[PDB]
Amino acid sequence: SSGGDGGATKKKVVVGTDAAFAPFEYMQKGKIVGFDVDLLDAVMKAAGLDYELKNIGWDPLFASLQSKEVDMGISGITITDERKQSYDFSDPYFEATQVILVKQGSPVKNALDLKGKTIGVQNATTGQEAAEKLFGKGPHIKKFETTVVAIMELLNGGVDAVITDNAVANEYVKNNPNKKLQVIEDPKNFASEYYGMIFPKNSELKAKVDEALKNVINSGKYTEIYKKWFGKEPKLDRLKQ
Ligand SMILES: NC(=[NH2+])NCCC[C@H](N)C(=O)O
C-alpha cells in the first residue's frame, strides 16, 4: 500500500484540456465551458466515473498523458496515425477540417497562395502539420502555445494567415465581426479530421468511455449538446466512418 491510501477513497479521473479553443473549451467567468466540457460531463456520468477537469494547456496535456499524471484528455483533439503510436483514442465524436483564417483584405484564395507568407499555428497541432505539408517545415510557420495567441498575431499583422480548425475559426468570426476576419476553406488541400478523447497507451478507461459515448449518442444527449453549441442538427453518420 506504500505510496497510496490502500483504497480509503476512490480517486477521481484526472482529465486535462487546453481551454483556449472556443466553442470546444474556453474560460468564462473563471469556469471551463464549451462543447467538449458538456460532452465530457455527460460521458463520464454515463460511465459512472467521478472526474476533475483541469485547464493544463496544450503541450503540458500531451506531456502529462505520456507520464500518466493525467488519465484522459478532451481538447478538440484530432485522431492521427502518429498520435496513435503514443496514445489511445476513443471512438470519434466530431468531424472537422483545417481552414485558413485571414483578414478581410487578404489576397489569399487557397492554400497555395500562402507561398512566401508567414503562417501562424498552435504548436504540435494538425494545423501546424497541414502548414508544413504545403511548402515544407521552416521558420515561415510561427508556432504558439495557444490558438488564441495565433489569432492575436493575425490581428496585429505578426502573421499573414492562421491555419486552425473550422469550427474554431467560424466561431471566432461569428463572435468578432468588428475584427473583419474571414475563413478561406480549401477542401482539395485539407483532409477530413475526426476528434477523439485521448488516453495514455493501454488505458483501462478507453472501453468505459467508448460505451458511455455510445450511451450519450443513443439517448439523444449528444445531439442536445450539439444543438446548444452549433444551432443545427448533427449528422450522426459522420461518427461511423
Ligand atoms: N484545445 C485545443 N487547443 N485544441 C487544438 C486542436 C487542434 C487540432 N484538432 C489537433 O488535434 O491538433
Solving technique: X-ray
What are the strands, taking DSSP E only, across the chain? 13-17, 26-28, 31-33, 51-55, 72-73, 87-89, 94-96, 98-103, 119-122, 141-144, 161-165, 181-184, 193-195, 198-200
Distance 18 CA to ligand 1 centre (A): 8
User: Kind and range of the H or E element at 168?
Assistant: helix 166-175
Domain limits for position 84: 13-95+194-233
Same domain, 78 and 43: yes
Nearest Cα to Cα of residue 62 among 48, 43, 82, 45: 82
List CB contacts of 199: < 8 A, sequence separation 6 or more: 65, 71, 72, 73, 87, 88, 89, 90, 205, 206, 209
In whole angstroms, what is the distance from residue 215 CA to residue 79 CA? 21
Cα of 3 vs centre of ligand 1, distance in Å, is 34
Give 155's contacts (C-beta < 8 A, 6+ positions apart): 103, 179, 181
DSSP state of 240: G
239 falls within a domain: no
- C-alpha cell of residue 217: 449518442
Domain count, the chain: 2
Integer Cα distance of 144 and 138 in angstroms: 14
The residue count of the chain comes to 241
Distance CA(104)–CA(241), nearest Å, equals: 35
Distance 206 CA to ligand 1 centre (A): 20
Please, are residues 126 and 98 in contact by the beta-carbon 8 Å criterion?
yes
Q: What values do phi and psi take at 67, rounded to 5?
A: -80, -10
Cis amide linkage into residue 23, ω under 30° from 0: yes
Nearest to 53 by CA among 18, 21, 24: 18
Is residue 167 in a domain? yes
Residue 203 neighbours by CB under 8 Å, 6+ apart: 71, 72, 88
**Listed residue (155, 128, 152, 124) closest to 57, CA to CA:** 124
Q: Residue 144 C-alpha to ligand 1 middle, in angstroms?
A: 12
Distance (Å, rounded) from C-alpha 64 to C-alpha 62? 5
Q: Which atom of ligand 1 lies at the shortest distance from residue 78's CA?
A: 11
Flag whether 115 is in a domain.
yes
Whether residues 39 and 51 fall in one domain: yes
18 shares its domain with 90:
yes
Query: Which residues, other chains included, contact 31 with Cβ-Cβ below 8 Å and sequence gap of 6+?
Result: none
Mutation to probe ligand 1, out of 78, 82, 84, 133 (largest number of atoms < 8 A from CB): 78
Nearest atom, ligand 1, residue 83 CA: 11
Residue 141, domain member (yes or no): yes
Question: What distance in Å separates the CA atoms of residue 199 and residue 63, rounded to the nearest whole number?
Answer: 12
Co-location of 38 and 72 in the same domain: yes
- Amino acid letter at 178? N
What are the residues whose beta carbons fall under 8 Å from the beta carbon of 81, sequence distance 6 or more? none
Resolution in A: 1.8
Residue 125 Cα: closest atom of ligand 1? 12
CATH number of the domain bearing residue 56: 3.40.190.10
Residue type, 116: G
Q: Three-class SS string for 59-84?
A: HHHHHHHHHCCCCEECCCCECCHHHH
Pocket of ligand 1 from Cβ distances under 6 Å: 18, 21, 25, 58, 75-78, 122, 125-126, 147, 165
Residue 97, phi then psi, degrees to nearest 5: -150, 160
